[PDB]
Amino acid sequence: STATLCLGHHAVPNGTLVKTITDDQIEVTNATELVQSSSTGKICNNPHRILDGIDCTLIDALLGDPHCDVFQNETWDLFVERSKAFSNCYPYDVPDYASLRSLVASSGTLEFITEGFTWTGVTQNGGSNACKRGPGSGFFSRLNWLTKSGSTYPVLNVTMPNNDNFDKLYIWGVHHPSTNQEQTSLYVQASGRVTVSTRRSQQTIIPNIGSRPWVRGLSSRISIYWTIVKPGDVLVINSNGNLIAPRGYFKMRTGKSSIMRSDAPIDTCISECITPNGSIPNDKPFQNVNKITYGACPKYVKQNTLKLATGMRNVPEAIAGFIENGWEGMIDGWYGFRHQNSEGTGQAADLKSTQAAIDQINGKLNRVIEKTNEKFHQIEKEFSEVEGRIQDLEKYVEDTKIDLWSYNAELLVALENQHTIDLTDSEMNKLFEKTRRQLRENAEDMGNGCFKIYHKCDNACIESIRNGTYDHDVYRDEALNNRFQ
Amino acid sequence: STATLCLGHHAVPNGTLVKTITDDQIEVTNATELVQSSSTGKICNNPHRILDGIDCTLIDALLGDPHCDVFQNETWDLFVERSKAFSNCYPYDVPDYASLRSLVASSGTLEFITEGFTWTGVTQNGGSNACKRGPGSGFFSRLNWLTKSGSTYPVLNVTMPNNDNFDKLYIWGVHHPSTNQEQTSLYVQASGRVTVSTRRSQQTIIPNIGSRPWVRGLSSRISIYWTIVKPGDVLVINSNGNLIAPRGYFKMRTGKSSIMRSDAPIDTCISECITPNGSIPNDKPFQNVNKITYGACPKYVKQNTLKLATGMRNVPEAIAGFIENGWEGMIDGWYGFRHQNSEGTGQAADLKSTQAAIDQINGKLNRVIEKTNEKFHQIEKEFSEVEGRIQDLEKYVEDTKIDLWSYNAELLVALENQHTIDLTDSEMNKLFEKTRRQLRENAEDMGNGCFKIYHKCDNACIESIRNGTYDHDVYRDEALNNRFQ
Amino acid sequence: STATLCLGHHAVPNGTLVKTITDDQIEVTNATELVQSSSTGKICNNPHRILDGIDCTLIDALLGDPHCDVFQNETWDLFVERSKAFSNCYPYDVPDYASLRSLVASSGTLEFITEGFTWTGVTQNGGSNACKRGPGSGFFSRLNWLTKSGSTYPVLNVTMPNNDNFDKLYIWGVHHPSTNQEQTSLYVQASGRVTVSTRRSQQTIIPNIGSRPWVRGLSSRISIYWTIVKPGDVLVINSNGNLIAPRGYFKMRTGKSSIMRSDAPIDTCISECITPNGSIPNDKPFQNVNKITYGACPKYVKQNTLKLATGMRNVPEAIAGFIENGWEGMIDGWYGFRHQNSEGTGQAADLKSTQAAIDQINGKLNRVIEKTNEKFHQIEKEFSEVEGRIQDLEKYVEDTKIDLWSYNAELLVALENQHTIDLTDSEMNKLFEKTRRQLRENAEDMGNGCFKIYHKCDNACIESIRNGTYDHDVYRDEALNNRFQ
Ligand SMILES: *[C@@H]1O[C@H](CO)[C@@H](O)[C@H](O)[C@H]1NC(C)=O
Ligand SMILES: *[C@@H]1O[C@H](CO)[C@@H](O)[C@H](O)[C@H]1NC(C)=O
Ligand SMILES: *[C@@H]1O[C@H](CO)[C@@H](O)[C@H](O)[C@H]1NC(C)=O
Ligand SMILES: *[C@@H]1O[C@H](CO)[C@@H](O)[C@H](O)[C@H]1NC(C)=O
Ligand SMILES: *[C@@H]1O[C@H](CO)[C@@H](O)[C@H](O)[C@H]1NC(C)=O
Ligand SMILES: *[C@@H]1O[C@H](CO)[C@@H](O)[C@H](O)[C@H]1NC(C)=O
Ligand SMILES: *[C@@H]1O[C@H](CO)[C@@H](O)[C@H](O)[C@H]1NC(C)=O
Ligand SMILES: *[C@@H]1O[C@H](CO)[C@@H](O)[C@H](O)[C@H]1NC(C)=O
Ligand SMILES: *[C@@H]1O[C@H](CO)[C@@H](O)[C@H](O)[C@H]1NC(C)=O
């Protein structure tokens, strides 16, 4: 009479295919997708403060477009700028539009403190029929269209010191009229000038008296410039004409605020990661939704699928063990022992090796990857305009980052899956050689992941081999007589 | 009488040295270079459309330099700009030259549609002796040098709507004369002005009446600007003077087109990857030729050599096996069995383990690397000018990319070679323990990668061990009597 | 009588914790920090030439601020710009300040060659009380404030050819006065002009007659521009007024020079790597001190600690061997043999496997990492100003690089530590199976990393097993009689 102890591992009929260093496509028992390929479709408004620019750009809310009067003094961690947005005030252009938009977005607040500028000998609060405030004519609420008073426009020259402890942002402008008649009617001088200076900075702009396309009934423009006044510094606005003055300063801050062009609707939910396609869950280490991200988002990768083997290698199917096949009928644990003796066939898992493999497998990826990279303000990555050098450089930087992180994700998945598979085979072989070392001369490796044990082995003794208390010398005198004789 | 079965692997006298994680320099049987270090020397003109700018820059072909009249309406996937190139027309400078060059290169076409601009009260088709068209005086063929008609130069003011479904590109200019006499002779106003506007954009340029170096007999210049008109938009050209008008618009496209500064000649061959040094083969995953690439090119790496072990570890040299030495006299396969019995010494490979190792080794690198990264338009990376901030940023981005990809290539080669070596030793040891499991108690591991088999083993039985049909129990009663007695 | 040979490895009570692919926190015998987290606090002035800008910016030393007269013609490999720096001359602003600063820093020399500009009909060597040279009024020493001579300011128009073999750098300026009275008093024309041109370049600047904050007693400014003249080219300075001419040219070079904002003091020591926090040792492959680097510096990584296992796995504690525990009482070598026989217990290391493991472990990281990346001039990474697009792009490039290199460092440490641990366990198991192959049938694996040897084994024979000369057949007839009987 002899016994048989086969060592084995769990298998599943539902084998998931993964990628490794050594195999293009290998079948494992379980796998987790690391690439968030689909979004919720909606921008969840927590924990980040989401400001919906329903029909307003950021610059139109800054300047005070009347339909953006509902954005006076609004703060945000993300400004969602809709493609539906339009302007309904005096036609304007921002030289260096993207820089102003970016610094106002990172500022995270349109907190406008009005200041007592003493514009003397000049008519304030100029207006236009291209911005009906409500009824009648108006203008940007955060600007002051100055025009001649009587028969002259003096050389305006005012100062404003920054005695506070923060950067002030002064949004000013220059009026480019259409005709010299319009110039000399608004500003008596034949060609104006707007200088705005600090102790360390300068901008001087000569207006551009020339006609141009009719936008809301005007062949004139406002060229919007800005000036950042540091603490202790001082602003000076000098002007010979064509000045669109500021009424005050925008309280600059520095923080996690940003801006995002999106058309997805906001919804009352919770999500750390926001994309133009909506909020996504940050549970996975990579994504494929969009490269434009805000918050604790995963990394963007070109790959649409990257399956990490969070389980072992699958070999789905005389009680032969692991050298031949894996066991489908073992859910008690990962690695285990089947056994055949006179007291009846049976099975029992080994939670030691199972729990070792799970302890190594449960926390694999989170010890070579980041928490979830919190990126709040980044470069622009979707361009509507054609600009050339700086746009191509931004595109190239982002494409470089994307290709590098895609390669890193591919190599990481391959390495971690190869290590998972070698680790699980290692635990199986370690259990095998452990049981070999318990059965010094009382057993023989049959070659199918199984020990033929040459003494009568009741289920108590099979359990003794399973749990490690098996003393070989009790049965040695019998097993040698059954092996070599 | 006893037999002897040694297991072994192929070896070669021509051992190639490679790098791993664990060994600085280890000898393997075969190795493939992954870094394309040398070029063909010629730019192959397929599958990409290569336009040879024989003596023409891209901007001189855009504007219509007479010796670039052969580039009217030419399209390309790559514009090869020769260092031999020169200008032979009115001296000019492009403020933001690189941006115009880049967007015209990505445009991939100089398709110029002439438009009926109504320049009234003004003499069109001005010319110069600094561009002989052929005989006589001429000008850029895609521009229109306007000058006074009679005794006055009116305030030119024309419009052109973009009712089409593509971006129009209007290349216009401003004439900077040398003297006020030249100004008031060409343009009656003492100081001109050129405004070019759309519903959302602006450029207004006051000319610069001042002398400057004589280039082709002139101390005057053309400052070339551009304006991109989106669909539905409208262009307006206003001017008080010094206008170099456009005759039409360049049909902007968006695609795989680009530009490359090179002196290599074009040749009728096929190659996906183009560099300034010539076309190179894209068979290898990395390169060292140049960082400037067009097409399906490998990645640039600082390394000049990176040998991937596409073979196993080399140990070149009583029929002792793999624990001692490798076999030079085995080409039948990778892993194999030598044997010594009474019926004569012999040898035979094992195609199972050989083909396993080759199946794992043939497709290693192409399951963690990209297809071949198709990069068409990228930043400029070789600068002739000194520009400071943007140039240093482009250089830093490219050097960052190069160092990162060089490190990735080094780590990848080390990892893949270490995995190759461990994999081949693993297949050898797996075959060894397989043969151990076939020879349960009939054999003994001699310690030189060899089993001394303690029964008479004819060549049929050695083949039985080789192919897996060896049943131990037939010879057990004899082998135990020969081992322990 | 029987003997016992246990194989084992060294252990230490001082176990250092490290990170791997398979274990979050595993205990090893020795570990090296790869992240230089602390600096010396001082900038060591060798081998790089360090120029201490004690109270001088680079532009103030370029132009010739009087308290920077001690920096005439100074050369550097690194210009240390102090936060204590101030200007004490005519108030000025540099449009494109950062580009001029960067190209003058990479130039690595303020070598100023004076040229014989023939400014005729005009008063040279203008001065101001905002730069007392020493006593009296003066100006920038490398500029020439031109003013009217008598009752007229002619149209200045001079040329200067670059007949040399290097780029010349001409630093010129434009005077923006406060009042039209000041303009027409200094420069008779009501609105000046400064054109500076070459055969391929242009800059024309109309001054800005407007008041502005009083800096050192003046509401006027100098707008500093530059012009780089290549070999064979020619400079032409034309001016209707408001010209701040150059007295000569700065000899541009190209090399390892750079600039760094720092407050750390210089000290006479030796160090290749300089940061604003001081010089640091470049012995480690990564750092956490600062991302701003000059010289042969390590790579910046967000991690503050990254311990590389330069030793094996620690298992600190009947002479049981390596399967159970590691040995604390073995310093002779890494892997070794303990033994118990009738001639007394004893111990002896195996320098073969020890030296194999050390040869593999001593040079691990330096065969997948770089020498130490020499980066001399890079982008600016700490910004005092808010600028928007280009600043955000520089920040994003550097943050991308930092996150990528941090991930690479983490993955590299995990991989190299996992390979160290698997390599050391591999050498231990290889020694174990070597000793198994020496003791073919004379021994039995007890299961605690130990062979019970079934013949009397004097210390000479234990040494025979240790050094490899052990012939099994001498003791086989006795060991079989002691094992199976
Ligand atoms: C808007 O902002 C500032 C912030 O202090 C405040 O003083 C001002 O009165 C506010 N006005 C409105 C209408 O919110
Ligand atoms: C302009 O006002 C500023 C206020 O800072 C002052 O410096 C300067 O004296 C004034 N100039 C004139 C002409 O009023
Ligand atoms: C996300 O939106 C971008 C831009 O609209 C689009 O290119 C991409 O295909 C979208 N992806 C998903 C998963 O919706
Ligand atoms: C050049 O381009 C446009 C493209 O349609 C065409 O209308 C025009 O007549 C072409 N002229 C020549 C000479 O190729
Ligand atoms: C200039 O022409 C444009 C054409 O779009 C038009 O808007 C404007 O009325 C014209 N102005 C004058 C003064 O002719
Ligand atoms: C390729 O060309 C570049 C620029 O001419 C040169 O720096 C490099 O050494 C060349 N490489 C080869 C392999 O020809
Ligand atoms: C400074 O630089 C140039 C370099 O040749 C030299 O000719 C000049 O005389 C030097 N002057 C002083 C004071 O160092
Ligand atoms: C100005 O001087 C330059 C010197 O290069 C010359 O080209 C030009 O003839 C001069 N013009 C006048 C009006 O003197
Ligand atoms: C180095 O200096 C920078 C800037 O002053 C600071 O942010 C950083 O904490 C410093 N690090 C060390 C290690 O001193």
Side-chain angles (χ1 to χ4, degrees), chain B residues 69 72-74 110-114 142 249 251:
Chain B
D69 281 6
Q72 291 189 359
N73 297 0
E74 280 286 340
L110 304 170
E111 195 177 323
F112 183 81
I113 313 298
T114 314
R142 311 311 207 181
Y249 62 93
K251 197 162 171 177

Side-chain angles (χ1 to χ4, degrees), chain C residues 36-39 275-277 288-291 382:
Chain C
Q36 187 65 36
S37 64
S38 70
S39 62
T275 56
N277 312 63
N288 196 247
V289 179
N290 209 339
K291 59 193 171 292
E382 281 282 326

Side-chain angles (χ1 to χ4, degrees), chain A residues 142-161:
Chain A
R142 311 311 207 181
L143 301 177
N144 189 0
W145 189 0
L146 300 160
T147 44
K148 63 170 206 311
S149 175
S151 60
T152 185
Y153 186 102
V155 180
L156 293 173
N157 171 32
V158 299
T159 183
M160 189 54 53

Side-chain angles (χ1 to χ4, degrees), chain A residues 45-63:
Chain A
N45 68 348
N46 290 299
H48 308 300
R49 200 184 189 287
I50 309 301
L51 192 61
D52 185 9
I54 56 173
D55 52 7
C56 286
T57 60
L58 178 51
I59 306 299
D60 286 315
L62 179 76
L63 300 161

Side-chain angles (χ1 to χ4, degrees), chain B residues 451-484:
Chain B
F451 299 96
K452 185 164 187 179
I453 296 160
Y454 284 81
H455 56 80
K456 68 172 75 67
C457 193
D458 58 328
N459 290 329
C461 189
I462 297 288
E463 181 58 284
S464 87
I465 305 158
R466 284 199 287 252
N467 75 331
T469 192
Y470 177 84
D471 197 72
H472 73 104
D473 211 278
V474 177
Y475 313 93
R476 190 184 174 83
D477 301 295
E478 183 178 354
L480 299 170
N481 180 88
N482 288 111
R483 281 177 77 194
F484 310 132

